[PDB]
Design a binder for this molecule. Structure first.
Ligand SMILES: CC(=O)N[C@@H]1[C@@H](O)[C@H](O[C@@H]2O[C@H](CO)[C@@H](O[C@@H]3O[C@H](CO)[C@@H](O)[C@H](O)[C@H]3NC(C)=O)[C@H](O)[C@H]2NC(C)=O)[C@@H](CO)O[C@H]1O
Ligand SMILES: *[C@@H]1O[C@H](CO)[C@@H](O[C@H]2O[C@H](CO)[C@@H](O[C@@H]3O[C@H](CO)[C@@H](O)[C@H](O)[C@@H]3O)[C@H](O)[C@H]2NC(C)=O)[C@H](O)[C@H]1NC(C)=O
Length: 361
């Protein structure tokens, strides 16, 4: 089984204990660690943060401890305009320029592959997406003739039915990609004003619509569109999504006024790190959707949909029973990496729980 884990560059700026450097990553926890995110300038892959080359170096030295660890560099992300991707992939000339620039960059900094994070391709992008993947892999096969291990190519894919039908030729890109990460944790659209869980495993016997917004559906669909199970990696969140309540109603369908107040270390409305949730739980009322099998909490006018060790173990069992390639975690720096916030003196509570289940066979 594969345990693919993301590390974000900007987590270095969080104050105090929230500050996280590649340094904190346990080299034996994951099988693959992906660094997010790289930029594109003059149609070439390029660094993002001023100290990326120092951090690249730090992350890749972990391979001196665990020789079997693979690292990848991810391009794109949310703060990268999807149009910018759209523009590079559409003109076969800027596409070739970008593709060509990747292997040397990866080789200079020591990465073992490239992760594509185009969020998200639209209807007019589908065909170009396929071409970008096809050609990038062809370039990787050709570069391995130099006598070095082929670089890996992976992609982070939307888990929404509409998004998938709209911009991805799954049967096509699955043949060229080494693995596909399913973003199965973005299921409650910031668009509506009701309370809901962003990463339910199952449909939830109490609701006739949006039966497409749960991990189980997303996986069954991908397997149907033609994605081989041994290439599919299911995403597991290490963060929670918060909401400020509009009334004293706390159960399903309860109304919302907007996102929850920011976390002290994460400082971003609507999001909380797991270690921040561990603190938030004190004095909070914990509940759990039984059909969906995911927990949520409430304190004052704050409502939080998250994942704990047992829902995370649950998801990992699910993934094994359906025989997928492994699990993907977003993101290491949101888990209790210091291990000093969530009670039990365990480092990376959530990611470890996932690894334990995966090691059982
Ligand atoms: C749940 C989750 O991971 N959400 C992701 C977003 O957090 C993320 O946006 C990032 O936001 C943070 C802050 O909102 C940005 O960090 C800032 O980075 C700048 C420039 O490097 C630095 O000077 C600031 O100190 C730092 N601000 C903070 C809050 O301390 C970060 O740059 C954003 N990401 C990027 C690459 O721009 C986006 C990332 O696209 O992904 C969400 O999934
Ligand atoms: C990721 O790469 C982007 C694409 O190369 C890069 O885009 C930006 O590049 C420059 C620098 O900020 C911006 O500014 C312009 O630069 C010329 C200076 O030669 C000025 O004459 C002009 O007035 C303008 O200020 C562009 O606006 C901008 N291009 C974009 C967004 O398409 C990004 O800076 C880079 N992102 C990061 C964080 O590195």
């Amino acid at each position: 089984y594969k345990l693919i884990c993301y590390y974000t560059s900007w987590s270095q700026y969080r104050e105090g204990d929230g500050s996280c450097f590649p340094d904190a990553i346990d080299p034996f926890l994951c099988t693959h660690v992906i660094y997010s995110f790289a930029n594109i300038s003059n149609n070439e892959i390029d660094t993002w943060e001023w100290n990326d080359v120092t951090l690249y170096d730090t992350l890749n030295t972990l391979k001196n401890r665990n020789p079997k660890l693979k690292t990848l560099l991810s391009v794109g992300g949310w703060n990268f305009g999807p149009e910018r991707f759209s523009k590079i992939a559409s003109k076969t000339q800027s596409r070739r320029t970008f593709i060509k620039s990747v292997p040397p960059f990866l080789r200079t900094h020591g990465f073992d592959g490239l992760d594509l994070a185009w969020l998200y391709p639209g209807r007019r992008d589908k065909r170009h997406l396929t071409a970008l993947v096809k050609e990038m892999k062809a370039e990787f096969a050709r570069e391995a003739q130099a006598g070095t291990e082929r670089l890996l190519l992976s992609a982070a894919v939307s888990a929404g039915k509409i998004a998938i039908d709209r911009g991805y030729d799954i049967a096509q890109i699955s043949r060229h990609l080494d693995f596909i990460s399913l973003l199965t944790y973005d299921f409650h659209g910031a668009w509506r004003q009701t309370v809901g869980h962003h990463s339910p495993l199952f449909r939830g016997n109490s609701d006739a619509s949006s039966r497409f917004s749960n991990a189980d559906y997303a996986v069954s669909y991908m397997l149907r569109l033609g994605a081989p199970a041994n290439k599919l990696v299911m995403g597991i969140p290490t963060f929670g999504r918060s909401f400020t309540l509009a009334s004293s109603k706390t159960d399903v369908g309860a109304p919302i006024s907007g996102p929850g107040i920011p976390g002290r270390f994460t400082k971003e409305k609507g999001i909380l790190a797991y270690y921040e949730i561990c603190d938030f739980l004190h004095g909070a009322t914990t509940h759990r959707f039984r059909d969906q099998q995911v927990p949520y909490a409430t304190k004052g006018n704050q409502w939080v949909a998250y994942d704990d060790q047992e829902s995370v173990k649950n998801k990992a069992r699910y993934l094994k029973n359906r025989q997928l390639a492994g699990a993907m975690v977003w993101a290491l720096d949101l888990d209790d990496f210091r291990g000093t916030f969530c009670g039990q003196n365990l480092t990376f509570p959530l990611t470890s729980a996932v690894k334990d289940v995966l090691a059982r066979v």
